[PDB]
Structures are given as C-alpha cells and as structure tokens.
Amino acid sequence: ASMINIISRLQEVFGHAIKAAYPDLENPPLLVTPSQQAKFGDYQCNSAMGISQMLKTKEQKVNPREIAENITKHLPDNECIEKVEIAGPGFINVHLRKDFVSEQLTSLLVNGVQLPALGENKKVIVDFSSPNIAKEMHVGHLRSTIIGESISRLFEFAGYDVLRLNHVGDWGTQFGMLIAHLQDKFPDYLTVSPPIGDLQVFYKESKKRFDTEEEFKKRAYQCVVLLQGKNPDITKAWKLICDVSRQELNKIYDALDVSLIERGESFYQDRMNDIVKEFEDRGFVQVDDGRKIVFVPGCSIPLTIVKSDGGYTYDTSDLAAIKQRLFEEKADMIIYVVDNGQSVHFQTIFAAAQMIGWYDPKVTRVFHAGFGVVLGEDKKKFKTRSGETVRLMDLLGEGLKRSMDKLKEKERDKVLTAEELNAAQTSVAYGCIKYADLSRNRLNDYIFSFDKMLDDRGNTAAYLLYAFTRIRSIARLANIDEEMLQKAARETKILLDHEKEWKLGRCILRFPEILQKILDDLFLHTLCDYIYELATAFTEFYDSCYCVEKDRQTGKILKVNMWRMLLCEAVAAVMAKGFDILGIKPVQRM
Numbered sequence: 001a002s003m004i005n006i007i008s009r010l011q012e013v014f015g016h017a018i019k020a021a022y023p024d025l026e027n028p029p030l031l032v033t034p035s036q037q038a039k040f041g042d043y044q045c046n047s048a049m050g051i052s053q054m055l056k057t058k059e060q061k062v063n064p065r066e067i068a069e070n071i072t073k074h075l076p077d078n079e080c081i082e083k084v085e086i087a088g089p090g091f092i093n094v095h096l097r098k099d100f101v102s103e104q105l106t107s108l109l110v111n112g113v114q115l116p117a118l119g120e121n122k123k124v125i126v127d128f129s130s131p132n133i134a135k136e137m138h139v140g141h142l143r144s145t146i147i148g149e150s151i152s153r154l155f156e157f158a159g160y161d162v163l164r165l166n167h168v169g170d171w172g173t174q175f176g177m178l179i180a181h182l183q184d185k186f187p188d189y190l191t192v193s194p195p196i197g198d199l200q201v202f203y204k205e206s207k208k209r210f211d212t213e214e215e216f217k218k219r220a221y222q223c224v225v226l227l228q229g230k231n232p233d234i235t236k237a238w239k240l241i242c243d244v245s246r247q248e249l250n251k252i253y254d255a256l257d258v259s260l261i262e263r264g265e266s267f268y269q270d271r272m273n274d275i276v277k278e279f280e281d282r283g284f285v286q287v288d289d290g291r292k293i294v295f296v297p298g299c300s301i302p303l304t305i306v307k308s309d310g311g312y313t314y315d316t317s318d319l320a321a322i323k324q325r326l327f328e329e330k331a332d333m334i335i336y337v338v339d340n341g342q343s344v345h346f347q348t349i350f351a352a353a354q355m356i357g358w359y360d361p362k363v364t365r366v367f368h369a370g371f372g373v374v375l376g377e378d379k380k381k382f383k384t385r386s387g388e389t390v391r392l393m394d395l396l397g398e399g400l401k402r403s404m405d406k407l408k409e410k411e412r413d414k415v416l417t418a419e420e421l422n423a424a425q426t427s428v429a430y431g432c433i434k435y436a437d438l439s440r441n442r443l444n445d446y447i448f449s450f451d452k453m454l455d456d457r458g459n460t461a462a463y464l465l466y467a468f469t470r471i472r473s474i475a476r477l478a479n480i481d482e483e484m485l486q487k488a489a490r491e492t493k494i495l496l497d498h499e500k501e502w503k504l505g506r507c508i509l510r511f512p513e514i515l516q517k518i519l520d521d522l523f524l525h526t527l528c529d530y531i532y533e534l535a536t537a538f539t540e541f542y543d544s545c546y547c548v549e550k551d552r553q554t555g556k557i558l559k560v561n562m563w564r565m566l567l568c569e570a571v572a573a574v575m576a577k578g579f580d581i582l583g584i585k586p587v588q589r590m
C-alpha cells in the first residue's frame with residue numbers, strides 16, 4: 001500500500017459535496033490547498049468563493065458563505081476529515097482526523113515510501129543532456145542532464161514507463177572538417193585505430209584548417225555529403241570520432257550517476273528521407289533558394305528541412321524523431337529538456353507535427369521543459385577566462401576539491417576513509433551541484449556559485465545532507481537498530497498530541513501531493529522547497545520534543561519514546577526519496 005494524495009482525496013470529497021448541494025453546476029472550481037497557519041486547520045477549500053464568482057452576474061452576486069454552508073452540509077462520510085469550519089467570506093477550513101494521519105505515518109514506515117501506480121501504463125520519453133559530438137559539452141548540457149535525470153526519476157517513481165533518450169548532436173556539418181582532418185593526420189585510420197587525443201584540440205586543429213584553406217573547406221563539405229551518402233570509409237571515420245567522444249561523455253555520466261540510451265540525430269537518417277517526402281506529398285513544402293522549407297501557419301519562422309545541397313538539418317531530424325516517438329515508441333508523453341533559446345524551434349516543430357496530423361495535443365502530451373542560461377557571479381555567460389567553454393569534468397573536479405576542503409575541519413579524523421575520502425566528499429559535491437540548479441525555477445537564469453552552493457546553512461545540499469545525517473543519528477545513538485525500528489513500526493501507535501509532532505506529521509504526508517503537482521508543471525524546485533520545509537519542520541519538533549531522556553549525570557539514556565523515534569524514521573524515509581528523485585545521494589555519517 002502507498003501514500004495517499006490528500007489534496008486529491010479532499011478534492012474528491014468536496015467534489016461529491018458540491019455536486020450534492022448544487023447538482024446543476026458544471027465544472028465547479030475545487031481549489032484545495034494546505035494551510036500555512038495551524039490556526040486555520042490543515043487544508044483549505046476555496047470552491048465556494050470560486051462558485052459565487054462563476055454565477056456572478058450584473059445584478060446579482062451570491063454570498064460565498066451561504067454556498068460554503070450548503071457545501072459543508074453535504075459532505076459525505078469520509079475517513080480523513082475531523083471537522084470543517086467556514087471562515088471569513090466563505091473559506092472552508094479543513095481539520096484532518098488524528099487517526100488518519102497517525103495511521104498513514106505508520107503505513108509509510110511499514111510498506112516504505114511509495115506512490116500508487118498508474119491504473120494503466122504510460123510511456124514517457126525524456127530527451128535530455130544531448131551534447132554535440134566533437135564540441136565541448138557545456139553547462140547548458142549539464143542543466144539539461146541534471147534536470148532531465150530528476151524528471152525521469154520522478155515519472156519512474158510515479159510508475160510510468162520511462163525511456164531516457166540522449167539526442168546527441170552526431171550528424172552535423174560539424175563532421176566535414178573533422179573527418180577530412182582525421183584522414184590527413186591518420187592515413188591508416190581504416191586499420192590502425194587513430195590516437196585522437198583530446199577531441200577539442202583535434203577540433204581546433206581542423207577548424208584552423210577549415211578557416212584558412214579554401215580548398216580544404218571544399219573537401220570538408222564533400223565529406224559531409226559522403227557521410228549522408230553512407231560511404232563506408234567516411235562512415236568509419238565518423239564512428240572513430242564518435243567513439244572518442246563517447247568515452248569522455250561516459251566519464252561525466254558516471255560521475256553524475258545518469259543513465260541514458262544514446263540515440264543521436266544519425267539514428268534517424270533513413271526516416272528523414274520519408275519525412276521530407278511526406279511534407280512534400282501533403283503539400284506543405286515550398287522551394288526557396290534551392291531549400292525545401294515549411295511554413296507553419298501561426299509560426300514566426302519556417303522549418304528548413306532540406307538545404308540547397310540536399311543535406312538534412314536539425315529541423316529534419318527533430319521532425320523524424322518526434323514522428324517515430326509518436327508511432328514506433330507509441331509515447332503517451334514526450335518531454336524535451338532543452339535550453340529556452342530553442343523555444344521557438346520546438347514550438348514550430350510541435351506545430352508542424354500537429355499540422356500534418358501526427359498527434360493531438362489533447363491526447364498526447366508534448367512538452368518543452370526549458371531552462372535559462374548559466375551565469376557566473378558577474379551575471380554574464382558562464383565561461384572560462386577566457387573566454388571559452390568550461391570542461392564539465394573540471395567543474396566537477398573543482399566540486400570534489402572544495403567538498404573535501406570543507407570536510408577537513410575536521411572530519412578526516414572521525415570517519416572511515418570510505419565514509420569520508422569518498423562518501424561524504426562526492427555526496428556533497430555532486431549533491432550541491434545538482435541541488436543548486438534544481439532548487440531554483442528552471443526557467444530563470446542560474447548563477448553558478450561554488451560558495452553559495454557549498455554553504456552549510458540555509459537551502460543547500462550541504463545543509464540538507466547534514467540534517468539528514470542528524471536525523472539518522474538519533475536512532476543510531478540510542479542503539480535502536482533497523483530490526484527494532486521495523487518491529488516498533490508494526491506495533492507502535494504513533495502519537496501526535498504535540499503541536500510540533502502534528503505540524504511534522506502532516507508535512508510528511510504532503511510528499512505525494514507535492515510530486516503530483518510536479519508531474520504537471522515539471523517544476524522540480526518545489527520538491528526542493530518541500531525537502532527544506534520538511535527539515536525545518538523536523539528541527540522545530542526536535543527542539544520541543546525529547547526522543548530520548550538520558551537524565552543528567554551521567555547522561556546514559558534510560559528512556560526511549562519509540563513513537564518520536566519513528567517520526568524521525570518517517571522524516572528520513574521521505575527525505576531519502578526526495579533526494580533520490582533529485583539524483584542526490586545521502587550519506588549516513590558525514
């Protein structure tokens with residue numbers, strides 16, 4: 001059995017009530033939200049304010065308070081509602097039954113923290129990371145990677161069948177000069193696998209040629225046509241160059257703990273020929289300067305689906321890719337995690353796909369989840385002085401360094417070398433790199449700051465991961481092992497008489513409702529906001545309620561309130577999932 005979405009349950013209850021009080025009213029508002037101040041209950045329903053605002057006319061405006069009255073008068077018998085009260089104009093304040101909350105806290109402790117599955121399976125495709133081969137993967141790709149991983153995890157946790165696609169840029173004209181140069185530098189590449197060093201030095205080598213030698217440029221353009229032509233030798237060089245890129249990428253994905261099925265633009269090369277003919281045959285194609293282009297009614301720009309030279313484009317592959325995901329993959333949802341600079345691009349592509357009838361946005365969710373740019377502390381584009389793209393591995397390396405530094409006051413002397421000399425160091429470094437991104441609205445520009453993100457106090461992974469170790473330490477330092485806790489879970493009636501154990505209990509039980517909202521807006525920062533809220537709710541609890549009494553001298557225990565122990569476990573279980581959804585790896589000791 002799994003956690004219950006209280007907002008959905010409450011919406012279902014007031015739903016039946018409103019239908020009973022006002023049977024002829026259609027699509028009444030059902031805004032149910034958690035109360036911030038315990039004064040006014042645990043949840044609030046505003047539907048009576050919204051209902052009067054529906055029936056509002058020129059001459060007559062019904063009092064919300066009377067509506068509230070009819071609504072509450074028709075509340076069905078339910079398991080979660082203690083009592084309700086009508087407040088102010090017509091706010092409906094909701095108090096949860098103590099039994100319900102207590103029992104649900106127990107339920108997550110015994111069956112673990114988990115979501116109710118989809119009634120029917122659903123396939124979600126998440127298109128993220130997607131660096132360009134031969135060019136340096138940059139912080140834009142980092143964001144996509146971090147955000148996409150966490151989205152994927154969220155839908156997995158929610159029971160969706162998730163396909164993680166790395167839509168890599170491996171079909172550009174970027175390859176012409178690279179291949180030509182490979183051929184010149186390693187004339188035996190066809191047999192002797194060439195020792196390409198850093199792909200970027202090699203790119204820079206061939207780009208100087210590309211920019212200075214007119215005749216070389218021509219070869220490069222031909223290599224691109226031969227590559228599209230599936231020429232064996234040219235294709236072999238393309239594989240060898242991609243191989244080299246792949247091993248570098250795998251370093252980053254392993255570090256970041258990310259799993260991705262590679263499926264670059266090159267994957268769709270056959271399907272692109274069809275895509276072009278299908279737009280031609282349906283009459284959507286216009287010839288312009290030798291280019292085959294497509295105007296989508298409503299859009300600011302046309303799609304270029306074939307260049308003058310017969311070469312396919314980024315528009316061509318996105319069109320091939322969205323089509324195969326709709327028909328072959330039979331996706332119920334496709335999520336594109338790409339920088340906001342490409343909004344216009346994806347808006348036109350989706351428009352193009354609807355125009356030719358590949359999907360109905362009411363039946364299939366197709367969603368561009370964009371994100372703002374990465375800035376330094378100067379509010380200009382995050383670069384390396386000067387003024388070039390920063391190696392992600394360097395970025396990560398600098399994280400691991402600063403994390404260890406933090407730890408050496410003075411924790412190199414408490415923890416195992418494993419506990420520290422990796423577990424805490426890597427956990428904090430990567431956690432802070434992820435948390436600093438995801439904890440802010442993805443849409444906004446993001447100031448990448450090692451100092452802000454590694455800070456021990458406030459909304460950081462450093463605070464939260466530490467708060468997590470403390471919460472675990474309580475049962476640890478009272479010798480209540482995992483078998484005792486599991487046992488206690490099955491037997492102890494969790495008690496919620498204190499103000500702070502009630503605040504904390506009802507906060508814990510909000511986890512499912514938080515996640516479900518994120519499935520709709522794909523705003524992961526509210527999950528962060530909730531982890532932080534949860535930590536704060538815990539600290540307030542702990543500072544008002546003893547989990548163990550040690551009785552002064554000589555401070556050696558002699559009392560364990562097993563229900564406040566369990567509360568601690570429920571907090572950490574929920575925090576642990578949350579971290580997991582964000583791709584954050586909590587440690588035990590730190």
Ligand SMILES: NC(=[NH2+])NCCC[C@H](N)C(=O)O
Binds near residue numbers: 130132336
């Ligand atoms: N379906 C997609 N277009 N996914 C994103 C591709 C991102 C592209 N490789 C870039 O560097 O900008």
